[PDB]
Amino acid sequence: NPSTTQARVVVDELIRGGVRDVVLCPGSRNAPLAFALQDADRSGRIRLHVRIDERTAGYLAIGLAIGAGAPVCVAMTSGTAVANLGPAVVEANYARVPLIVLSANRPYELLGTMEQLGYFGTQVRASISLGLAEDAPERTSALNATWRSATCRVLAAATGARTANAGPVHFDIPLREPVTPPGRPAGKPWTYTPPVTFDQPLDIDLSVDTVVISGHGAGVHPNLAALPTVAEPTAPRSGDNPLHPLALPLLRPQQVIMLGRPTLHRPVSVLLADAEVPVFALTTGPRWPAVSGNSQATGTRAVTTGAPRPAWLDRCAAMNRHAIAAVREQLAAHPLTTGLHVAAAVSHALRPGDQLVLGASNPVRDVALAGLDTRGIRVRSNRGVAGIDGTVSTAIGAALAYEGAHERTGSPDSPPRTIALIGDLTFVHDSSGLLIGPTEPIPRSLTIVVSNDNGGGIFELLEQGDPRFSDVSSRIFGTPHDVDVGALCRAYHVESRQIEVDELGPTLDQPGAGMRVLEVKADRSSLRQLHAAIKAAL
Amino acid sequence: HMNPSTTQARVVVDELIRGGVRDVVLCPGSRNAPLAFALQDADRSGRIRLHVRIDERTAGYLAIGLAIGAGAPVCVAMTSGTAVANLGPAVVEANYARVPLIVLSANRPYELLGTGANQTMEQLGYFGTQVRASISLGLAEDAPERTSALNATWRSATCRVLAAATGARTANAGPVHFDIPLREPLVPDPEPLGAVTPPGRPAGKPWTYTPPVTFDQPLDIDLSVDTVVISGHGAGVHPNLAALPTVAEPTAPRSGDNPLHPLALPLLRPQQVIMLGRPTLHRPVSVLLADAEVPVFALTTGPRWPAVSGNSQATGTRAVTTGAPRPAWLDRCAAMNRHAIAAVREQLAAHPLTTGLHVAAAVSHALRPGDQLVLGASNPVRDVALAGLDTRGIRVRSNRGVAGIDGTVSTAIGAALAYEGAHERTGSPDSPPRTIALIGDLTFVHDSSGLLIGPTEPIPRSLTIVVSNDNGDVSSRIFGTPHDVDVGALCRAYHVESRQIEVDELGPTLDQPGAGMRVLEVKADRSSLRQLHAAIKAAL
Amino acid sequence: MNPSTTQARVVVDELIRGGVRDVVLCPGSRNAPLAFALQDADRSGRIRLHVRIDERTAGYLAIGLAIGAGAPVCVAMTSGTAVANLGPAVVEANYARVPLIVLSANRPYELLGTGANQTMEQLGYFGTQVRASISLGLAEDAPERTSALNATWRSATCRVLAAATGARTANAGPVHFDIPLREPLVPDPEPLGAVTPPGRPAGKPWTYTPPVTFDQPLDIDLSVDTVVISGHGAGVHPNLAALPTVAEPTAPRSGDNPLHPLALPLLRPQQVIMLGRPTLHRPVSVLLADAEVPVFALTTGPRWPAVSGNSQATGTRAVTTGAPRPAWLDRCAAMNRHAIAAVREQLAAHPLTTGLHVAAAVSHALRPGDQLVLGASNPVRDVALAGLDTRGIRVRSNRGVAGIDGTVSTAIGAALAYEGAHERTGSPDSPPRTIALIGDLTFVHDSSGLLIGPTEPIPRSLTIVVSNDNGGHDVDVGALCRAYHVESRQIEVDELGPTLDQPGAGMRVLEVKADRSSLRQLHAAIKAAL
Amino acid sequence: PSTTQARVVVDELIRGGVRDVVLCPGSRPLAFALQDADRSGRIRLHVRIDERTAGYLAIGLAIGAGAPVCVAMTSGTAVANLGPAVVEANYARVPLIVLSANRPQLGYFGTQVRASISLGLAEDAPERTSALNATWRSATCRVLAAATGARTANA
Numbered sequence A: 001n002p003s004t005t006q007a008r009v010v011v012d013e014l015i016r017g018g019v020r021d022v023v024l025c026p027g028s029r030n031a032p033l034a035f036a037l038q039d040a041d042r043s044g045r046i047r048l049h050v051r052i053d054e055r056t057a058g059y060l061a062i063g064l065a066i067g068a069g070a071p072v073c074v075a076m077t078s079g080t081a082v083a084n085l086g087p088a089v090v091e092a093n094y095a096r097v098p099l100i101v102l103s104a105n106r107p108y109e110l111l112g113t114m115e116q117l118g119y120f121g122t123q124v125r126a127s128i129s130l131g132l133a134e135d136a137p138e139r140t141s142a143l144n145a146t147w148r149s150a151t152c153r154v155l156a157a158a159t160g161a162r163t164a165n166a167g168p169v170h171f172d173i174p175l176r177e178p179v180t181p182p183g184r185p186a187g188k189p190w191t192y193t194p195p196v197t198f199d200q201p202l203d204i205d206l207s208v209d210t211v212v213i214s215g216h217g218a219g220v221h222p223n224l225a226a227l228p229t230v231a232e233p234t235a236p237r238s239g240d241n242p243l244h245p246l247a248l249p250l251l252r253p254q255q256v257i258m259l260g261r262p263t264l265h266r267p268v269s270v271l272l273a274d275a276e277v278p279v280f281a282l283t284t285g286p287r288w289p290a291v292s293g294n295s296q297a298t299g300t301r302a303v304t305t306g307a308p309r310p311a312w313l314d315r316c317a318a319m320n321r322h323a324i325a326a327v328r329e330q331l332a333a334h335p336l337t338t339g340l341h342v343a344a345a346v347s348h349a350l351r352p353g354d355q356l357v358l359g360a361s362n363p364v365r366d367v368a369l370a371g372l373d374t375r376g377i378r379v380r381s382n383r384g385v386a387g388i389d390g391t392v393s394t395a396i397g398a399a400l401a402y403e404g405a406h407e408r409t410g411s412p413d414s415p416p417r418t419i420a421l422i423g424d425l426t427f428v429h430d431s432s433g434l435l436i437g438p439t440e441p442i443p444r445s446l447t448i449v450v451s452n453d454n455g456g457g458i459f460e461l462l463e464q465g466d467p468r469f470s471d472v473s474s475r476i477f478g479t480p481h482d483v484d485v486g487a488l489c490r491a492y493h494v495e496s497r498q499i500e501v502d503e504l505g506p507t508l509d510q511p512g513a514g515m516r517v518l519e520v521k522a523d524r525s526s527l528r529q530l531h532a533a534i535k536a537a538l
Numbered sequence B: 001h002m003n004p005s006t007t008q009a010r011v012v013v014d015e016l017i018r019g020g021v022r023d024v025v026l027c028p029g030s031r032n033a034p035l036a037f038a039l040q041d042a043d044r045s046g047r048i049r050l051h052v053r054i055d056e057r058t059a060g061y062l063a064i065g066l067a068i069g070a071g072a073p074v075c076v077a078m079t080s081g082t083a084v085a086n087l088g089p090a091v092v093e094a095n096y097a098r099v100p101l102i103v104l105s106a107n108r109p110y111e112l113l114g115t116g117a118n119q120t121m122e123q124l125g126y127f128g129t130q131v132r133a134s135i136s137l138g139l140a141e142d143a144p145e146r147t148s149a150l151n152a153t154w155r156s157a158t159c160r161v162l163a164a165a166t167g168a169r170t171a172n173a174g175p176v177h178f179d180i181p182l183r184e185p186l187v188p189d190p191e192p193l194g195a196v197t198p199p200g201r202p203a204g205k206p207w208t209y210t211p212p213v214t215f216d217q218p219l220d221i222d223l224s225v226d227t228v229v230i231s232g233h234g235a236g237v238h239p240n241l242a243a244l245p246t247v248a249e250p251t252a253p254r255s256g257d258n259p260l261h262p263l264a265l266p267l268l269r270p271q272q273v274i275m276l277g278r279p280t281l282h283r284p285v286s287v288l289l290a291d292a293e294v295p296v297f298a299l300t301t302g303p304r305w306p307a308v309s310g311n312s313q314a315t316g317t318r319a320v321t322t323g324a325p326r327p328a329w330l331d332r333c334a335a336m337n338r339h340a341i342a343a344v345r346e347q348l349a350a351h352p353l354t355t356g357l358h359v360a361a362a363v364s365h366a367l368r369p370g371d372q373l374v375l376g377a378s379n380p381v382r383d384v385a386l387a388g389l390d391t392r393g394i395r396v397r398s399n400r401g402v403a404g405i406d407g408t409v410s411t412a413i414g415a416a417l418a419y420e421g422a423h424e425r426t427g428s429p430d431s432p433p434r435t436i437a438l439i440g441d442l443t444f445v446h447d448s449s450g451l452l453i454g455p456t457e458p459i460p461r462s463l464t465i466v467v468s469n470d471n472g473d474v475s476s477r478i479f480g481t482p483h484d485v486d487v488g489a490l491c492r493a494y495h496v497e498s499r500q501i502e503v504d505e506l507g508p509t510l511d512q513p514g515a516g517m518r519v520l521e522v523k524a525d526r527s528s529l530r531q532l533h534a535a536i537k538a539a540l
Numbered sequence C: 001m002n003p004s005t006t007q008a009r010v011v012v013d014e015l016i017r018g019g020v021r022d023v024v025l026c027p028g029s030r031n032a033p034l035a036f037a038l039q040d041a042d043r044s045g046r047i048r049l050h051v052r053i054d055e056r057t058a059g060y061l062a063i064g065l066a067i068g069a070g071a072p073v074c075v076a077m078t079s080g081t082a083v084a085n086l087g088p089a090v091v092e093a094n095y096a097r098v099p100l101i102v103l104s105a106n107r108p109y110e111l112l113g114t115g116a117n118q119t120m121e122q123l124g125y126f127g128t129q130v131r132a133s134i135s136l137g138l139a140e141d142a143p144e145r146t147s148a149l150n151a152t153w154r155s156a157t158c159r160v161l162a163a164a165t166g167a168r169t170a171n172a173g174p175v176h177f178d179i180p181l182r183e184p185l186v187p188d189p190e191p192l193g194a195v196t197p198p199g200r201p202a203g204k205p206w207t208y209t210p211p212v213t214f215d216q217p218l219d220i221d222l223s224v225d226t227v228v229i230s231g232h233g234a235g236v237h238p239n240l241a242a243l244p245t246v247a248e249p250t251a252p253r254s255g256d257n258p259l260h261p262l263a264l265p266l267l268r269p270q271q272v273i274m275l276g277r278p279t280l281h282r283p284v285s286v287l288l289a290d291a292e293v294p295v296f297a298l299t300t301g302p303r304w305p306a307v308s309g310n311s312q313a314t315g316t317r318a319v320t321t322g323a324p325r326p327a328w329l330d331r332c333a334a335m336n337r338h339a340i341a342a343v344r345e346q347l348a349a350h351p352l353t354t355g356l357h358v359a360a361a362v363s364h365a366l367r368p369g370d371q372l373v374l375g376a377s378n379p380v381r382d383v384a385l386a387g388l389d390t391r392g393i394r395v396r397s398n399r400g401v402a403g404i405d406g407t408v409s410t411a412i413g414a415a416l417a418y419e420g421a422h423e424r425t426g427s428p429d430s431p432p433r434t435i436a437l438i439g440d441l442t443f444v445h446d447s448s449g450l451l452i453g454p455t456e457p458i459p460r461s462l463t464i465v466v467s468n469d470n471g472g473h474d475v476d477v478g479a480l481c482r483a484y485h486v487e488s489r490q491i492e493v494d495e496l497g498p499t500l501d502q503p504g505a506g507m508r509v510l511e512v513k514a515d516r517s518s519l520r521q522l523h524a525a526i527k528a529a530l
Numbered sequence D: 001p002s003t004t005q006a007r008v009v010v011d012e013l014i015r016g017g018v019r020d021v022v023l024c025p026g027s028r029p030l031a032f033a034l035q036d037a038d039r040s041g042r043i044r045l046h047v048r049i050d051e052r053t054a055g056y057l058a059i060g061l062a063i064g065a066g067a068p069v070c071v072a073m074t075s076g077t078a079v080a081n082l083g084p085a086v087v088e089a090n091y092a093r094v095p096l097i098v099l100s101a102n103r104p105q106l107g108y109f110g111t112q113v114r115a116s117i118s119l120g121l122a123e124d125a126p127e128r129t130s131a132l133n134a135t136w137r138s139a140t141c142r143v144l145a146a147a148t149g150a151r152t153a154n155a
């Protein structure tokens, strides 16, 4: 059929545009481009990943995109796919992840009597349809240009080539119920759009006592490298002057440089809201955040005058040392192993070149409390909406894409490690992400570390964790589950081991099966007291 | 003086209880703490039964089960962000099955939308046209002078949510998105500084009383014309059609005692069809409903009427019948029904290997009156209809809305909990009625996390899940090889009793008194299924 | 002071700090708090307020006020059909990238679904047509949170302005700013003045968004035989000024080598440089649909047009090498002379007066510094056919969707905003002229735009030339102008130039009878003469 | 092909009680069938230049005697111009059928209308012309039922 020629042209243009991975699920109707994707997979031009669970498939695609920075397609095949992909599409929108959602509508069928929800109108960068492929035998040159131009538009919108705001894209290729026209020479994309430079310099005086708060999506800024910096784990670091998050309330910054989108630490929110502290927002795309409407100016880079006062740098470094010491000393003086102990052990075990995947809740916070040095490390976390859903498949896709990048450099060395640190509720939410068929790509160096305190530890640290709610907070916030994690991994044929926090390090230096789950049992009944002891030791 | 979030949550929870809500599913979060606190106290005082789950998606199907088990509206309460998005699949199913599901989502204040605030998304309107209504409560204001007026607006909006979900005025029940923006303080103030919840109407009545509506649309039908009835999901009960030959899907309520096997329909020539509810299961029904020659009369309980037939001469709610079926027609239909039943019975016995059709037949023969049968929406529902189950006296549930694989375990669990709950309230000292679920291995593995019930949460008292495990176009490469998951290992991970048994023991094991919740795994073969179905067709 | 007044006054002050000089208001009870704060700023001279009855025509007035000088413009109306009436102007503002802020007053969202009067689903009505749908939080009685509410109110307003002006996206367009308002809606007694919570010092906006630059350079070899096609929204490119250029009347001209659109089908360029969004000429669309000629697309916003399928590359500027071959330049110049002569000679030979004659007369009478406003259908085409030289004059047309809606109000708004910027340079010269060319059908359809209350600002030098070919109704144009008390005259095409040379008598309508029965024969003579 | 689609739908609308149709001049077949039906006296056609006024004319034609009325959009400014009339018809429960034709937008349609039904492309194939007849008339009957509130009591 002429629609097969269409599918082969689109898959080819997608591959020319940098797509190396596509996720599919089996469905009622044939997947969009399902056979052209089958052809491309057997040739090794693209790599296919199949899953039954459409929600975990969406989050696998997110992992495959953030693992190495490439656009990733997901092929919708059912009337439950839109609903199940919603979570991943929302996360793609807010974390600016280039996610292409492929659909195949049927224009000859009656409508008003793909099960559509309301989020496509709000979450996607673009919604493009290809139009019905006809058998026009002479217009093949024109239809090739039309299909490839539309595919280049889909890729440009998903990667933010013109907007500098990557995100999810809905790509519809309509199908009527049932020799490839060539592309540009040298495998180039049909419509070349050079990745745009989006520039907006801001004047900032660094002699004013300044702290840098960098969050998810922050850029790298060499002219700010000397400033004291509270950097979230997923922020790429510019300098060598880290400021511990717990030291921040011991200081009085006179101005704040906010890089990207911060979401962690109530002390950071308090400082960003303080109407007496000017906040300069520096972002990489057009979006910029505002805490209590306190943002004074926006920009993409700083034009700096002056330099930080040496006494200011000394004050920040002193408060930083007190914070590091309090955390280390109170961890040692605490008998029960908690999630914070696990995060410190994981943090000490990382090596340059590693990839770190962090779940929401305490893990992404605990790693910052443990003072992880992220330089040389690639840190991922679904900070767009901070969901605890889909983190297992995100780590798997990230491990697969990160390994594929290393394999393509032809290095004879072993694939770099991907270490994931997630909580137990996070693991239970997306345990079905462990179900990978033998026919499907499986990571070769993925270790999932599950810090298991049989519930949600973070709620012990919030207002609902105050002792006056002790008789009611167990069911509705603690949420104990008593799941046998080792038996769960066994059911899915995944290597699993329960180890103690002191064994965690050594067990991680040892290579193992391509995919394994290390579970560390932790306590959350003493979490609130441990954090109070840290604050008192500051 | 209670803080505004606490006052609003307690009023809303109280009005939901007054509206018939007996069960609430809660998923943990911080932003929904006001709702969580108010719900925990209502559960402590016995006004509702709270079910806590970790995975919002399967929690939504738990709520569907809790609603179809006894017909009541059910709320599911979750925090802001992707937690709300995870309710999508259950919302879609609740829409098409007309299930009164209330998605009670906490939110950040709407003014934070667009600011980059953590865990904030376009929640209101997320579900689009799938919901019967998207209703937002206002952000609660600290205005003790306006407390009485705010009580009236909060309770009135809650009643509109309930009415829209139950179809109290539209006769078209379905899901409703109830979004509640909430700001700090989120936890109740110290009880020294305490106050009473702004009161509702006296005598536990709803703020706005909507008497359940009667929706009537009479239709004239002459039964002297050779007529077959095809009843699907949502079909009504029609005593004046009880004598007609009736092809009834397992979930359809039976109007009479004149069944007609689905395999018999293509071998007969009805001159007119009466279609009840939303029938989608059988292919010859779909083939015959596509026949432009046969006049089709559609009778629905609500204003939605199915589009399966293109020659629907008329659509109503009841039949005003004239005439009577010619006795030779009834004899021909009855004769062909017995012929179909015998062909299935013989070919099943003549088939050597145990198949899913054999497990479905064994479960059918083990059912007694008063049982609840929950069927996976894929093969189980078709196999039970092929094995000719008599559904009179048993309640049959199936997520026939979109017939997805998601949430079948949680639906079975929820249906069992609501079914047993209604039996308690009868005060009967009789033991809790049995719920039997029949699902395939791939469905069981997909929603195995639906088995996760926390140690403090309600567990069904008499639920048995029978898993027919047969270990099962480039997307279909995943089925060529077996998934290879151990059902027993999955049940141990979720601390669920499981046994691997054979089809001949299935009957007796099901007769054993209920050990709470258990999984009975019966191995089967799919390789020979194509030959078994071919043998049945040739025997007709 | 009631919170709905303090909220309205903070928003208006921040809008003013953000460059809003003109606001269009429609009467209603729900937008009363905005109306009072807007009348206050109009009294003190901070903005110029314009009141209209019809909200649809009010939207096109704000579009004219926006395109006349390039500033963001708000339109404030009441709840109900008023917002739905802004639909047509929001669609036009979207596709033409016009910074139009729709400031809608609404009953509290809690009243949605309760059967309240004049209450509808307003938030999200415009859907995908707006760059942002932002809502302010319902003003609460909390003086202890006044400073907090100030910051959030002024940050939201700055976010509204940035989205409308494309300050960080380079994609200007309409924004929905919905304000839920409850009673009391009028200002309480304000003896000895009330303190509005202040903005930043020195009139600076709350959040400072410095100028942004989107850069996407493309390598283009000018030695290849190149034609430039510039449409609506095109930027200015010095390094392309030597190339043959087919420029729509609204396109800013970068050079001095014009190529008539009629000459383009006489040429075979080897590559095309396309600027902005060209939609006007059929030979342009034919060339762009030729998948054998490579097209380079140079745009100012991230939106790049799709009229071409052989789009090789899209960017913002060209890095050029080489120079156009002299034989290519000579051939294009010769084809251009062919086209211009064919149009001029055949117009001079035609015995009747057609719309093409009216358009050519209006072109001849234009002087540098003039503003020309064109009805987006036939007038834009006829002026392009007549060969109008647009250098030194600012040409405006609702080229977004090219509807007949609101052309009169757009010309009125463009004239006012254009004259206002001429008063801003302190120059003692008389107000520069605004000449509008519209067809009779367009004029009757938007004749209600002529309704301007005695107190509202009236243009000082606006002349609307109506080309009346009785269809493009039997309505009397002069009778329409008398109902609205606007000066009108029926004149001949020979009298057009001299009558336009008279100093502007405020607002006047010049009606020129034209024939359309002989049009097809005039066009055939032009095509045959090429 | 598409011409036959237009005749069947027009005929079914008249069978459903539509006695008046408002259309506005524009580019966007169906106008031909309505023209045949007007020349034959089965339906009364009303033409207006202003699309907003056309919507309010149709509202009047519907509330004048209680019948369903159709309005035929034909341009890219039609959806926005019919907005005010559609909102009025929503809240006043007026049976207003809005006829469009896309080639295989604002957010108000998703909030204001009782239903949104697309007929589907007309495939040249007289082997199933009887089934295409039933599918078109069935969907047209669904549109009339949704507009008049025949099953919901909510015109």
Ligand SMILES: Cc1ncc(C[n+]2csc(CCOP(=O)(O)OP(=O)(O)O)c2C)c(N)n1
Pocket: A339, A359, A360, A361, A362, A363, A386, A387, A388, A389, A422, A423, A424, A425, A426, A427, A451, A453, A455, A456, A457, A458, A459, B028, B029, B030, B056, B079, B081, B082, B083, B086
């Ligand atoms: C999809 C989703 N549902 C609910 C939440 C609310 N939430 C935030 S943290 C948390 C607990 C997570 O527990 P766990 O993974 O065990 O981590 P811990 O904090 O105990 O280390 C929950 C439910 C969320 N972020 N995302």
Ligand SMILES: O=C(O)c1cc(O)c2ccccc2c1O
Pocket: A093, A094, A095, A096, A216, A217, A218, A260, A261, A283, A284, A285, A287, A288, A289, A290, B114, B115, B116, B117
């Ligand atoms: O900088 C980023 O990466 C970023 C990402 C986002 O999704 C935002 C959403 C709203 C507001 C600001 C945002 C932002 O600054």
Ligand SMILES: O=C(O)c1cc(O)c2ccccc2c1O
Pocket: C113, C114, C115, C116, D090, D091, D092, D093
């Ligand atoms: O009775 C009616 O005619 C009527 C009509 C409407 O459009 C309503 C809209 C919202 C709420 C109540 C409504 C109502 O009672």
Ligand SMILES: [Cl-]
Pocket: C266, C267, C268, C269, C331
């Ligand atoms: Cl040439």
Ligand SMILES: [Mg+2]
Pocket: A423, A424, A425, A451, A452, A453, A454, A455, A456, A457
């Ligand atoms: Mg935990």
